[PDB]
Each structure stands twice: as structure tokens, then as C-alpha cells.
């Protein structure tokens, strides 16, 4: 009936601003200038395919 | 056949010696036929067997064992039990003689041996018929040889890390297989 308390571990290399570099490149740098237009035209042209 | 002992008194047990002396010199003088004298000018009890009165040769060492067990920290009545019977020994060990502990780790080790409100200590005494005094770090155990090996094995299982609930459970199993014999 002795329960110790959980040591909450400390993460390793998995942080949302370090995930962005784990693939080939720096993925923050290949972005667009208008995400809203990218979204609405991407959806429409998907449906027209 | 005139012979003596002299055993010293550490200062934290010098108040309770001069505070309970009245119950100590009687069952050393008539019942044992033994001639006490407490020196203060070197802080020590001294005993001597006087060749006329005495009969039992083991009286001198019986008294020396009694006073010494009062010295290490055991209360009066328990030391009297050392004076009466013929099957009582004391075993003393440390905390650094099991596992080298220091810092806070050692004060937490004494916290597990003593338990809250003394409970854990008392359990070890009550289910083994021994008496434990737990000094600064040195731990002293009084009983008969098999019983003090039982209580030594529980105390050492408590120093090394095992929680106290496990040692209550294993203690009552030991009590079962002790009381039958
Ligand atoms: Mg945290």
C-alpha cells in the first residue's frame, strides 16, 4: 500500500518547432502567400477532377 | 574472590540514572548480594563482589549486563529482565553497516524503521518479543538469540528499502510460525 508518485518524464526531441525540420528540409520555408486562396481553389479543383 | 567491574555512563543517560537510582540499587544489593558504588568524579558505575555474602559467581556479570543495558538506552524494567533470566543478549549494529546511506537518505531510513508514532518499531517488538532502542543511527536489540535474529532480519529488510506494509505482513507470518513453537 505504498505508492510512489510518478516522475513526469522530460521529452527527447519531439517538439512542434523541431518536428518541422525532421524531414529533408526546413518545412517552414516552403509555404504560400495566401492560405485562404490555396484552400478554396484547391478544394474546387479537386471536385472538378 | 573480591572482584569488580566499572562501566561508564554517557551523559544523555546520566539524568535518568540519577533519576531512577532508587529502583536500581535495591535489586542489585539484596537479591544479588553485590556491592554497588557510583562514582561521579569519573561518571561511572562501579560494582564489586564482596567475598563473604555472595553465592552465585555469575552475579557480577549479571549486574554488569544489567547496568550496561540500561546505559545503551533500554528502560528500567527491560534491563531488570536482563538481570533475572539467563537467556538475554543484546545485538547492536548501524545503518552504515547494511547500506551506506547519508544525507537525507539516512534520516528517511530511520523514519521507516521507527514508523509514525512509533508504530512500526512497536510492531517489530511485539511480534518478536524483543525490545529495540533506536539511537542516533546505531540500533540496539534485546532478546533471546533466535528472536533477535528475527528482528534483525526485519530491521535490515527495512533499511534497504522495502516499504513498511510488506514488513507488517511478513512480520505477522513470522509471528504465526513463532508462537506455535
Ligand atoms: Mg513539467
mmCIF file of C-alpha atoms and ligand atoms in Angstrom:
data_model
loop_
_atom_site.group_PDB
_atom_site.id
_atom_site.type_symbol
_atom_site.label_atom_id
_atom_site.label_comp_id
_atom_site.label_asym_id
_atom_site.label_seq_id
_atom_site.Cartn_x
_atom_site.Cartn_y
_atom_site.Cartn_z
ATOM 1 C CA UNK A 1 0.000 0.000 0.000
ATOM 2 C CA UNK A 2 2.962 2.297 -0.608
ATOM 3 C CA UNK A 3 2.533 4.057 -3.921
ATOM 4 C CA UNK A 4 5.256 6.394 -5.032
ATOM 5 C CA UNK A 5 4.476 9.352 -7.206
ATOM 6 C CA UNK A 6 5.055 9.447 -10.926
ATOM 7 C CA UNK A 7 8.146 11.168 -12.129
ATOM 8 C CA UNK A 8 6.819 13.014 -15.138
ATOM 9 C CA UNK A 9 9.480 12.435 -17.768
ATOM 10 C CA UNK A 10 11.162 15.077 -19.868
ATOM 11 C CA UNK A 11 10.787 14.742 -23.609
ATOM 12 C CA UNK A 12 13.580 13.915 -26.033
ATOM 13 C CA UNK A 13 13.435 15.635 -29.418
ATOM 14 C CA UNK A 14 9.790 15.850 -30.279
ATOM 15 C CA UNK A 15 8.681 19.462 -30.060
ATOM 16 C CA UNK A 16 6.344 21.122 -32.547
ATOM 17 C CA UNK A 17 9.068 23.549 -33.616
ATOM 18 C CA UNK A 18 11.560 20.739 -34.059
ATOM 19 C CA UNK A 19 9.256 18.411 -35.925
ATOM 20 C CA UNK A 20 9.343 20.913 -38.762
ATOM 21 C CA UNK A 21 12.963 20.132 -39.521
ATOM 22 C CA UNK A 22 12.971 16.365 -39.310
ATOM 23 C CA UNK A 23 12.205 15.624 -42.939
ATOM 24 C CA UNK A 24 14.604 16.548 -45.721
ATOM 25 C CA UNK A 25 14.322 20.302 -45.336
ATOM 26 C CA UNK A 26 13.144 23.237 -43.263
ATOM 27 C CA UNK A 27 9.453 22.891 -43.931
ATOM 28 C CA UNK A 28 8.646 26.349 -42.706
ATOM 29 C CA UNK A 29 10.185 27.839 -45.764
ATOM 30 C CA UNK A 30 8.111 26.217 -48.446
ATOM 31 C CA UNK A 31 4.866 27.943 -47.732
ATOM 32 C CA UNK A 32 2.496 30.197 -49.631
ATOM 33 C CA UNK A 33 1.383 33.810 -49.535
ATOM 34 C CA UNK A 34 -2.320 33.231 -49.288
ATOM 35 C CA UNK A 35 -3.536 30.138 -47.462
ATOM 36 C CA UNK A 36 -7.190 31.038 -47.880
ATOM 37 C CA UNK A 37 -6.975 31.133 -51.651
ATOM 38 C CA UNK A 38 -4.864 27.983 -51.635
ATOM 39 C CA UNK A 39 -7.645 26.297 -49.721
ATOM 40 C CA UNK A 40 -10.652 27.387 -51.727
ATOM 41 C CA UNK A 41 -9.094 26.792 -55.100
ATOM 42 C CA UNK A 42 -7.588 23.509 -54.026
ATOM 43 C CA UNK A 43 -10.959 22.213 -52.920
ATOM 44 C CA UNK A 44 -12.825 23.352 -56.029
ATOM 45 C CA UNK A 45 -10.318 21.912 -58.430
ATOM 46 C CA UNK A 46 -10.327 18.677 -56.509
ATOM 47 C CA UNK A 47 -14.054 18.409 -57.131
ATOM 48 C CA UNK A 48 -13.602 19.249 -60.784
ATOM 49 C CA UNK A 49 -11.209 16.370 -61.066
ATOM 50 C CA UNK B 1 37.106 -13.597 45.096
ATOM 51 C CA UNK B 2 36.804 -9.877 45.725
ATOM 52 C CA UNK B 3 36.183 -8.618 42.237
ATOM 53 C CA UNK B 4 34.750 -5.688 40.369
ATOM 54 C CA UNK B 5 33.538 -4.058 37.239
ATOM 55 C CA UNK B 6 33.272 -0.438 36.296
ATOM 56 C CA UNK B 7 31.120 0.726 33.428
ATOM 57 C CA UNK B 8 30.865 4.253 32.150
ATOM 58 C CA UNK B 9 27.774 6.375 31.666
ATOM 59 C CA UNK B 10 27.266 8.602 28.642
ATOM 60 C CA UNK B 11 25.711 11.920 29.561
ATOM 61 C CA UNK B 12 22.287 11.565 27.997
ATOM 62 C CA UNK B 13 21.765 8.613 30.297
ATOM 63 C CA UNK B 14 23.066 10.226 33.347
ATOM 64 C CA UNK B 15 19.939 12.159 34.235
ATOM 65 C CA UNK B 16 17.750 9.027 34.081
ATOM 66 C CA UNK B 17 20.303 7.116 36.107
ATOM 67 C CA UNK B 18 20.316 9.631 38.948
ATOM 68 C CA UNK B 19 16.589 9.927 38.369
ATOM 69 C CA UNK B 20 15.808 6.231 38.684
ATOM 70 C CA UNK B 21 18.607 5.190 41.025
ATOM 71 C CA UNK B 22 16.140 4.350 43.761
ATOM 72 C CA UNK B 23 14.856 1.328 41.872
ATOM 73 C CA UNK B 24 18.335 0.208 40.803
ATOM 74 C CA UNK B 25 20.479 -0.214 43.863
ATOM 75 C CA UNK B 26 17.982 -2.484 45.726
ATOM 76 C CA UNK B 27 17.719 -5.323 43.170
ATOM 77 C CA UNK B 28 21.466 -5.119 42.837
ATOM 78 C CA UNK B 29 22.159 -5.379 46.567
ATOM 79 C CA UNK B 30 19.821 -7.813 48.373
ATOM 80 C CA UNK B 31 18.624 -10.079 45.547
ATOM 81 C CA UNK B 32 22.092 -10.315 44.084
ATOM 82 C CA UNK B 33 24.396 -9.805 47.116
ATOM 83 C CA UNK B 34 26.518 -7.267 45.360
ATOM 84 C CA UNK B 35 28.151 -4.043 46.442
ATOM 85 C CA UNK B 36 27.382 -1.064 44.205
ATOM 86 C CA UNK B 37 29.127 2.288 44.237
ATOM 87 C CA UNK B 38 28.553 5.023 41.700
ATOM 88 C CA UNK B 39 31.488 7.287 41.105
ATOM 89 C CA UNK B 40 30.639 10.781 39.989
ATOM 90 C CA UNK B 41 34.209 12.009 39.864
ATOM 91 C CA UNK B 42 34.597 9.930 36.747
ATOM 92 C CA UNK B 43 30.903 9.456 35.770
ATOM 93 C CA UNK B 44 30.752 5.713 36.073
ATOM 94 C CA UNK B 45 29.040 2.968 37.958
ATOM 95 C CA UNK B 46 31.289 0.506 39.750
ATOM 96 C CA UNK B 47 30.379 -2.859 41.133
ATOM 97 C CA UNK B 48 32.207 -5.185 43.420
ATOM 98 C CA UNK B 49 31.508 -8.647 44.676
ATOM 99 C CA UNK B 50 32.473 -8.956 48.348
ATOM 100 C CA UNK B 51 33.698 -12.460 49.181
ATOM 101 C CA UNK B 52 31.548 -13.006 52.267
ATOM 102 C CA UNK B 53 27.928 -12.693 51.217
ATOM 103 C CA UNK B 54 27.877 -13.769 47.574
ATOM 104 C CA UNK B 55 26.900 -17.191 46.304
ATOM 105 C CA UNK B 56 26.423 -17.128 42.592
ATOM 106 C CA UNK B 57 29.640 -16.495 40.678
ATOM 107 C CA UNK B 58 27.588 -15.124 37.784
ATOM 108 C CA UNK B 59 26.238 -12.296 39.914
ATOM 109 C CA UNK B 60 28.944 -9.836 38.954
ATOM 110 C CA UNK B 61 28.459 -10.231 35.241
ATOM 111 C CA UNK B 62 24.706 -10.340 35.728
ATOM 112 C CA UNK B 63 24.821 -6.910 37.311
ATOM 113 C CA UNK B 64 27.246 -5.544 34.746
ATOM 114 C CA UNK B 65 24.953 -6.681 31.957
ATOM 115 C CA UNK B 66 22.022 -5.060 33.722
ATOM 116 C CA UNK B 67 23.596 -1.648 34.143
ATOM 117 C CA UNK B 68 25.086 -1.684 30.644
ATOM 118 C CA UNK B 69 21.742 -2.453 29.089
ATOM 119 C CA UNK B 70 20.370 0.490 30.964
ATOM 120 C CA UNK B 71 23.255 2.520 29.583
ATOM 121 C CA UNK B 72 22.592 1.756 25.931
ATOM 122 C CA UNK B 73 19.116 3.110 26.291
ATOM 123 C CA UNK B 74 16.716 0.462 27.456
ATOM 124 C CA UNK B 75 14.266 1.397 30.159
ATOM 125 C CA UNK B 76 14.485 0.113 33.683
ATOM 126 C CA UNK B 77 12.061 -2.817 33.658
ATOM 127 C CA UNK B 78 13.579 -4.263 30.488
ATOM 128 C CA UNK B 79 17.033 -4.152 31.994
ATOM 129 C CA UNK B 80 15.583 -5.857 35.069
ATOM 130 C CA UNK B 81 14.512 -8.643 32.744
ATOM 131 C CA UNK B 82 18.150 -8.847 31.735
ATOM 132 C CA UNK B 83 19.035 -9.174 35.387
ATOM 133 C CA UNK B 84 16.638 -12.032 36.097
ATOM 134 C CA UNK B 85 16.666 -14.531 33.242
ATOM 135 C CA UNK B 86 19.582 -16.427 31.692
ATOM 136 C CA UNK B 87 18.740 -16.148 28.012
ATOM 137 C CA UNK B 88 19.003 -12.488 27.157
ATOM 138 C CA UNK B 89 21.505 -10.831 24.828
ATOM 139 C CA UNK B 90 21.826 -7.523 23.001
ATOM 140 C CA UNK B 91 22.895 -7.047 19.414
ATOM 141 C CA UNK B 92 23.922 -3.648 18.117
ATOM 142 C CA UNK B 93 24.542 -2.579 14.570
ATOM 143 C CA UNK B 94 24.496 0.539 12.459
ATOM 144 C CA UNK B 95 22.833 1.902 9.387
ATOM 145 C CA UNK B 96 26.054 2.267 7.510
ATOM 146 C CA UNK B 97 26.758 -1.383 8.166
ATOM 147 C CA UNK B 98 23.967 -2.506 5.913
ATOM 148 C CA UNK B 99 23.928 0.067 3.143
ATOM 149 C CA UNK B 100 25.981 3.241 3.020
ATOM 150 C CA UNK B 101 23.448 5.980 3.445
ATOM 151 C CA UNK B 102 23.978 9.611 4.240
ATOM 152 C CA UNK B 103 22.384 12.947 3.824
ATOM 153 C CA UNK B 104 18.658 12.968 3.863
ATOM 154 C CA UNK B 105 18.551 9.349 2.881
ATOM 155 C CA UNK B 106 19.631 8.354 6.367
ATOM 156 C CA UNK B 107 17.024 10.386 8.160
ATOM 157 C CA UNK B 108 14.402 8.831 5.945
ATOM 158 C CA UNK B 109 15.777 5.392 6.756
ATOM 159 C CA UNK B 110 15.338 5.999 10.441
ATOM 160 C CA UNK B 111 11.866 7.239 9.611
ATOM 161 C CA UNK B 112 10.964 3.912 8.093
ATOM 162 C CA UNK B 113 12.420 1.918 10.940
ATOM 163 C CA UNK B 114 10.599 3.945 13.556
ATOM 164 C CA UNK B 115 7.287 4.412 11.727
ATOM 165 C CA UNK B 116 4.812 7.127 12.591
ATOM 166 C CA UNK B 117 4.050 7.442 16.290
ATOM 167 C CA UNK B 118 6.478 4.615 16.821
ATOM 168 C CA UNK B 119 4.053 2.100 15.298
ATOM 169 C CA UNK B 120 6.438 0.254 13.036
ATOM 170 C CA UNK B 121 9.031 -0.125 15.756
ATOM 171 C CA UNK B 122 6.456 -1.429 18.183
ATOM 172 C CA UNK B 123 5.210 -3.951 15.685
ATOM 173 C CA UNK B 124 8.665 -5.439 15.345
ATOM 174 C CA UNK B 125 8.949 -5.674 19.084
ATOM 175 C CA UNK B 126 5.510 -7.046 19.719
ATOM 176 C CA UNK B 127 5.627 -9.826 17.187
ATOM 177 C CA UNK B 128 9.124 -10.939 18.133
ATOM 178 C CA UNK B 129 9.184 -10.448 21.928
ATOM 179 C CA UNK B 130 12.290 -8.296 21.763
ATOM 180 C CA UNK B 131 12.945 -4.679 22.671
ATOM 181 C CA UNK B 132 14.507 -2.211 20.267
ATOM 182 C CA UNK B 133 16.031 1.099 21.051
ATOM 183 C CA UNK B 134 16.952 3.158 18.053
ATOM 184 C CA UNK B 135 19.699 5.658 18.830
ATOM 185 C CA UNK B 136 21.152 8.320 16.566
ATOM 186 C CA UNK B 137 21.944 5.736 13.886
ATOM 187 C CA UNK B 138 23.070 2.757 15.937
ATOM 188 C CA UNK B 139 20.261 0.306 16.585
ATOM 189 C CA UNK B 140 20.190 -1.949 19.625
ATOM 190 C CA UNK B 141 18.083 -5.080 20.036
ATOM 191 C CA UNK B 142 17.449 -7.042 23.232
ATOM 192 C CA UNK B 143 16.057 -10.546 23.358
ATOM 193 C CA UNK B 144 16.816 -14.196 23.043
ATOM 194 C CA UNK B 145 19.106 -15.309 20.300
ATOM 195 C CA UNK B 146 16.560 -16.613 17.837
ATOM 196 C CA UNK B 147 14.181 -13.726 18.425
ATOM 197 C CA UNK B 148 16.826 -11.120 17.859
ATOM 198 C CA UNK B 149 17.792 -12.763 14.628
ATOM 199 C CA UNK B 150 14.169 -12.457 13.533
ATOM 200 C CA UNK B 151 14.039 -8.792 14.471
ATOM 201 C CA UNK B 152 17.419 -8.126 12.908
ATOM 202 C CA UNK B 153 16.180 -9.589 9.665
ATOM 203 C CA UNK B 154 13.112 -7.383 9.674
ATOM 204 C CA UNK B 155 15.065 -4.235 10.545
ATOM 205 C CA UNK B 156 17.613 -4.921 7.849
ATOM 206 C CA UNK B 157 14.806 -5.505 5.394
ATOM 207 C CA UNK B 158 13.591 -2.053 6.352
ATOM 208 C CA UNK B 159 16.877 -0.207 5.955
ATOM 209 C CA UNK B 160 17.488 -1.497 2.429
ATOM 210 C CA UNK B 161 14.318 -0.085 1.081
ATOM 211 C CA UNK B 162 11.318 -2.323 1.416
ATOM 212 C CA UNK B 163 8.187 -0.434 2.352
ATOM 213 C CA UNK B 164 6.674 -0.842 5.788
ATOM 214 C CA UNK B 165 3.470 -2.579 4.779
ATOM 215 C CA UNK B 166 5.394 -5.522 3.398
ATOM 216 C CA UNK B 167 7.184 -5.859 6.668
ATOM 217 C CA UNK B 168 3.985 -5.879 8.688
ATOM 218 C CA UNK B 169 2.723 -8.719 6.525
ATOM 219 C CA UNK B 170 5.882 -10.763 6.741
ATOM 220 C CA UNK B 171 6.041 -9.933 10.420
ATOM 221 C CA UNK B 172 2.695 -11.479 11.207
ATOM 222 C CA UNK B 173 3.675 -14.599 9.271
ATOM 223 C CA UNK B 174 6.813 -14.789 11.435
ATOM 224 C CA UNK B 175 4.603 -14.325 14.489
ATOM 225 C CA UNK B 176 2.479 -17.287 13.408
ATOM 226 C CA UNK B 177 5.452 -19.602 12.938
ATOM 227 C CA UNK B 178 6.980 -18.339 16.184
ATOM 228 C CA UNK B 179 4.044 -18.691 18.580
ATOM 229 C CA UNK B 180 3.435 -22.333 17.663
ATOM 230 C CA UNK B 181 6.982 -23.288 18.715
HETATM 231 MG MG1 LIG C 1 6.593 19.585 -16.279
#
